[PDB]
């Protein structure tokens, strides 16, 4: 749909070089074992990341823009849930979510 094209545009922007300084932690699933975060999957029931959103978009998994937005917001919420509020990754999440929310609000 036209709204899903707008969502795909947002996704492309979130993955683009101009946001890479703060978007990079969200590019791929959290590899909890690689990071020593042995409680991550006890705390985060539904992991999400931009590569998974992209795969879902490419596979036409999303019914509508609302479903896409719920996944992007789940990704940020997982970050806010797991990490202390003063962690660098939380500051990066807030900045990337600001990009997302302002452009999602421009949906046709
Ligand atoms: C998102 C998110 N939500 N919870 C976490 N993550 C996260 C995802 C990926 C990476 C990572 C590390 N390497 N690669 C290639 C990816 C690091 C983190 C966080 N760690 C972190 C993040 C940013 C900075 Cl500046 C310092 C530490 C802790 C776990």
From Swiss-Prot:
The name this protein goes by in its record: Bromodomain-containing protein 2
Bromo domain sequence ranges: 1-107
Main function: Chromatin reader protein that specifically recognizes and binds histone H4 acetylated at 'Lys-5' and 'Lys-12' (H4K5ac and H4K12ac, respectively), thereby controlling gene expression and remodeling chromatin structures. Recruits transcription factors and coactivators to target gene sites, and activates RNA polymerase II machinery for transcriptional elongation.
Additional note from the record: Some specific inhibitors of BRD2 that prevent binding to acetylated histone are promising therapeutic molecules for the treatment of cancers or inflammatory diseases. ABBV-744, a small molecule, has been tested on tumors with success: ABBV-744 antiproliferative activity is mainly restricted to cell lines of acute myeloid leukaemia and prostate cancer and is able to displace BRD4 from chromatin. GSK046 (iBET-BD2), which specifically inhibits the second bromo domain, is a promising therapeutic small molecule for the treatment of inflammatory and autoimmune diseases.
Effect of residue 35 to A: Reduced binding to histone H4 acetylated at 'Lys-12' (H4K12ac)
Record note on domains: The first bromo domain specifically recognizes histone H4 acetylated at 'Lys-12' (H4K12ac). It also specifically binds histone H4 acetyl-methylated at 'Lys-5' and 'Lys-12' (H4K5acme and H4K12acme, respectively). The second bromo domain recognizes and binds histone H4 acetylated at 'Lys-5' and 'Lys-12' (H4K5ac and H4K12ac, respectively).
Similarity section: Belongs to the BET family.
Assembly description: Homodimer. Interacts with E2F1. Interacts with (acetylated) STAT3; promoting STAT3 recruitment to chromatin. Interacts with CTCF; promoting BRD2 recruitment to chromatin. (Microbial infection) Interacts with herpes virus 8 protein LANA1.
Taxonomic source organism: Homo sapiens
Localization terms from the record: Nucleus; Chromosome
Stretch of the intact protein here: 347 to 454 of 801
């Amino acid at each position: 749909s036209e709204q899903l094209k707008h969502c795909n545009g947002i996704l492309k922007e979130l993955l683009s070089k101009k946001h890479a300084a703060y978007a990079w932690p969200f590019y791929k699933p959290v590899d909890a074992s690689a990071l020593g975060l042995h409680d991550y999957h006890d705390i985060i029931k539904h992991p999400m990341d931009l590569s998974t959103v992209k795969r879902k978009m490419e596979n036409r998994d999303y019914r509508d823009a609302q479903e896409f937005a719920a996944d992007v917001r789940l990704m940020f919420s997982n970050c806010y849930k797991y990490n202390p509020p003063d962690h660098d990754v939380v500051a990066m999440a807030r900045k990337l979510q600001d990009v997302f929310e302002f452009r999602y609000a421009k949906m046709p």
